Amino acid sequence: SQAEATRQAAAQEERLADLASDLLLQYLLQGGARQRGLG
């Protein structure tokens, strides 16, 4: 039942996570990296 659309949606969501996590994790590291950097 609409496997085609379901497929692209199943992947588009998976790949998205990889990106969403990229900036996410960066928010943490960047936070301390900027703080400690100054000093």
Short mmCIF file of N, CA, C and O in Angstrom, two decimals:
data_model
loop_
_atom_site.label_atom_id
_atom_site.label_comp_id
_atom_site.label_asym_id
_atom_site.label_seq_id
_atom_site.Cartn_x
_atom_site.Cartn_y
_atom_site.Cartn_z
N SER A 1 0.83 -1.20 0.00
CA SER A 1 0.00 0.00 0.00
C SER A 1 0.87 1.26 0.00
O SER A 1 1.36 1.68 1.04
N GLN A 2 1.04 1.85 -1.18
CA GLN A 2 1.85 3.05 -1.32
C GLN A 2 3.26 2.83 -0.79
O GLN A 2 3.81 3.66 -0.07
N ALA A 3 3.85 1.69 -1.16
CA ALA A 3 5.20 1.36 -0.73
C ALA A 3 6.22 2.34 -1.30
O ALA A 3 7.20 2.68 -0.64
N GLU A 4 5.98 2.78 -2.53
CA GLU A 4 6.88 3.72 -3.19
C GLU A 4 7.08 4.97 -2.34
O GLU A 4 8.20 5.27 -1.92
N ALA A 5 6.00 5.69 -2.08
CA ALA A 5 6.06 6.90 -1.27
C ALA A 5 6.60 6.61 0.13
O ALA A 5 7.32 7.42 0.71
N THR A 6 6.23 5.45 0.66
CA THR A 6 6.68 5.05 1.99
C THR A 6 8.19 4.85 2.03
O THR A 6 8.84 5.16 3.03
N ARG A 7 8.74 4.34 0.94
CA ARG A 7 10.18 4.11 0.85
C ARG A 7 10.95 5.42 0.96
O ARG A 7 11.75 5.60 1.88
N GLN A 8 10.71 6.32 0.02
CA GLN A 8 11.39 7.61 0.01
C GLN A 8 11.25 8.31 1.36
O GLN A 8 12.19 8.95 1.84
N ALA A 9 10.08 8.18 1.97
CA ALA A 9 9.82 8.79 3.27
C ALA A 9 10.61 8.10 4.37
O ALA A 9 11.03 8.73 5.34
N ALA A 10 10.80 6.79 4.22
CA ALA A 10 11.54 6.01 5.20
C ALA A 10 13.03 6.36 5.18
O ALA A 10 13.70 6.33 6.20
N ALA A 11 13.53 6.69 3.99
CA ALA A 11 14.94 7.04 3.83
C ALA A 11 15.17 8.52 4.12
O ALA A 11 16.07 8.88 4.87
N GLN A 12 14.34 9.37 3.52
CA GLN A 12 14.46 10.81 3.71
C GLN A 12 14.49 11.16 5.19
O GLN A 12 15.12 12.14 5.60
N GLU A 13 13.81 10.36 6.00
CA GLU A 13 13.76 10.58 7.44
C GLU A 13 15.03 10.08 8.11
O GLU A 13 15.53 10.69 9.07
N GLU A 14 15.57 8.97 7.61
CA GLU A 14 16.78 8.39 8.16
C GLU A 14 17.98 9.30 7.91
O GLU A 14 18.72 9.64 8.84
N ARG A 15 18.17 9.68 6.66
CA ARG A 15 19.28 10.55 6.28
C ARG A 15 19.20 11.89 7.02
O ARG A 15 20.22 12.46 7.41
N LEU A 16 17.98 12.38 7.20
CA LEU A 16 17.77 13.65 7.89
C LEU A 16 18.35 13.61 9.30
O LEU A 16 18.99 14.56 9.75
N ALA A 17 18.13 12.50 9.99
CA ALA A 17 18.64 12.33 11.35
C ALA A 17 20.14 12.58 11.41
O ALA A 17 20.63 13.27 12.31
N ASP A 18 20.87 12.02 10.45
CA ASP A 18 22.32 12.19 10.39
C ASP A 18 22.70 13.66 10.37
O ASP A 18 23.65 14.08 11.02
N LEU A 19 21.94 14.45 9.62
CA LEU A 19 22.20 15.88 9.51
C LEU A 19 21.77 16.61 10.78
O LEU A 19 22.54 17.40 11.34
N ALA A 20 20.55 16.34 11.23
CA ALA A 20 20.03 16.96 12.44
C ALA A 20 20.97 16.76 13.62
O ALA A 20 21.15 17.65 14.45
N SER A 21 21.58 15.58 13.69
CA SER A 21 22.51 15.25 14.77
C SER A 21 23.81 16.02 14.61
O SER A 21 24.42 16.44 15.60
N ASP A 22 24.24 16.20 13.37
CA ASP A 22 25.48 16.92 13.08
C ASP A 22 25.49 18.28 13.77
O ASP A 22 26.36 18.57 14.59
N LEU A 23 24.51 19.11 13.43
CA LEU A 23 24.41 20.45 14.02
C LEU A 23 24.13 20.36 15.52
O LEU A 23 24.63 21.17 16.30
N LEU A 24 23.34 19.37 15.92
CA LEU A 24 23.00 19.18 17.32
C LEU A 24 24.26 19.00 18.17
O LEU A 24 24.57 19.83 19.02
N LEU A 25 24.99 17.92 17.91
CA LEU A 25 26.22 17.63 18.65
C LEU A 25 27.17 18.82 18.60
O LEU A 25 27.87 19.11 19.57
N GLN A 26 27.19 19.51 17.46
CA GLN A 26 28.06 20.66 17.28
C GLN A 26 27.70 21.77 18.27
O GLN A 26 28.58 22.48 18.77
N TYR A 27 26.41 21.91 18.55
CA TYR A 27 25.94 22.93 19.48
C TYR A 27 26.59 22.77 20.85
O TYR A 27 26.89 23.75 21.53
N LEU A 28 26.80 21.52 21.25
CA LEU A 28 27.41 21.22 22.54
C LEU A 28 28.91 21.53 22.51
O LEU A 28 29.40 22.36 23.27
N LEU A 29 29.63 20.85 21.62
CA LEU A 29 31.07 21.04 21.49
C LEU A 29 31.40 22.52 21.29
O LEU A 29 32.21 23.09 22.02
N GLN A 30 30.76 23.13 20.30
CA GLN A 30 30.99 24.55 20.01
C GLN A 30 30.81 25.40 21.26
O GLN A 30 31.54 26.37 21.47
N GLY A 31 29.85 25.02 22.10
CA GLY A 31 29.59 25.76 23.32
C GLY A 31 30.82 25.86 24.20
O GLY A 31 31.25 26.95 24.56
N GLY A 32 31.38 24.70 24.56
CA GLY A 32 32.56 24.68 25.41
C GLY A 32 33.81 25.13 24.67
O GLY A 32 34.69 25.76 25.26
N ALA A 33 33.89 24.79 23.39
CA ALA A 33 35.05 25.16 22.58
C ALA A 33 35.22 26.67 22.53
O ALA A 33 36.34 27.18 22.54
N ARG A 34 34.10 27.39 22.48
CA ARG A 34 34.14 28.85 22.42
C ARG A 34 34.47 29.44 23.79
O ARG A 34 35.25 30.39 23.90
N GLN A 35 33.89 28.86 24.84
CA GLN A 35 34.13 29.33 26.20
C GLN A 35 35.59 29.14 26.59
O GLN A 35 36.29 30.11 26.87
N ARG A 36 36.04 27.90 26.60
CA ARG A 36 37.42 27.58 26.95
C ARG A 36 38.40 28.33 26.05
O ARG A 36 39.46 28.77 26.49
N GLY A 37 38.03 28.46 24.78
CA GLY A 37 38.89 29.15 23.83
C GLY A 37 39.30 30.53 24.31
O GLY A 37 40.45 30.93 24.16
N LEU A 38 38.36 31.25 24.90
CA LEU A 38 38.63 32.59 25.41
C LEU A 38 39.23 32.53 26.82
O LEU A 38 38.51 32.36 27.80
N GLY A 39 40.55 32.67 26.90
CA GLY A 39 41.22 32.63 28.18
C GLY A 39 42.63 32.10 28.08
O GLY A 39 43.02 31.53 27.06
#
